[PDB]
Ligand SMILES: O=C(O)[C@@]1(O)C[C@H](O)[C@@H](O)[C@@H]([C@H](O)CO)O1
Ligand SMILES: [Mg+2]
């Protein structure tokens with residue numbers, strides 16, 4: 001039972017500024033076999049289906065803007081958005097895929 | 113164009129059953145796992161389970177929260193994914209998404225639109 005805790009629950013920024021948010025894992029998601037961290041970030045714009053942002057902790061998914069950066073390893077992970085755009089308004093879930101799959105509780109990003 | 117389409121959503125009475133469908137195209141179905149994820153209104157995404165790819169023999173896994181109650185199966189001839197939900201409860205009322213999964217990225221890289229299930233007396 002791997003528990004991912006995300007912080008903050010919610011935050012609000014103006015367009016253009018930088019935001020950071022945390023994903024804390026109960027267990028190391030680092031895989032010796034391939035030296036990969038088994039954590040992914042998803043963006044769910046309101047009323048829309050989720051979208052994969054980053055996998056293996058830091059690898060951006062095809063098509064995803066460079067303003068999203070995943071970083072971290074082991075049990076401590078982070079998602080940074082350098083230069084928030086209006087498009088970025090969403091809840092961001094981290095998800096462990098070390099053992100089956102588990103989503104964190106979500107970080108809701110508002111822009112004003 | 114990779115596409116995933118959920119269906120089977122609607123009104124279900126408490127205690128009952130519902131089979132959800134997930135039709136796909138635009139990629140080699142059998143090369144991927146398929147996951148079911150749900151999200152009750154206002155709440156977090158919850159991974160329900162997945163069915164593996166051809167290389168893994170299409171075996172299945174489930175979250176402890178629906179293991180026993182929920183069943184996942186796939187139709188490789190038509191590239192459709194299914195979810196059989198039993199003993200429906202109010203807390204199962206949610207949006208249900210099918211998502212392409214696997215050990216390539218160890219993540220769900222394509223998602224359907226979803227179908228909503230409302231469990232109402
Ligand atoms: O063992 C794993 O870390 C992993 O999560 C990797 C892949 O996502 C996948 O193989 C999965 C297995 O299929 C178990 O469901 O295991
Ligand atoms: Mg790819």
Ligand SMILES: [Mg+2]
Nearest residue numbers: 084085086087
């Ligand atoms: Mg713009």
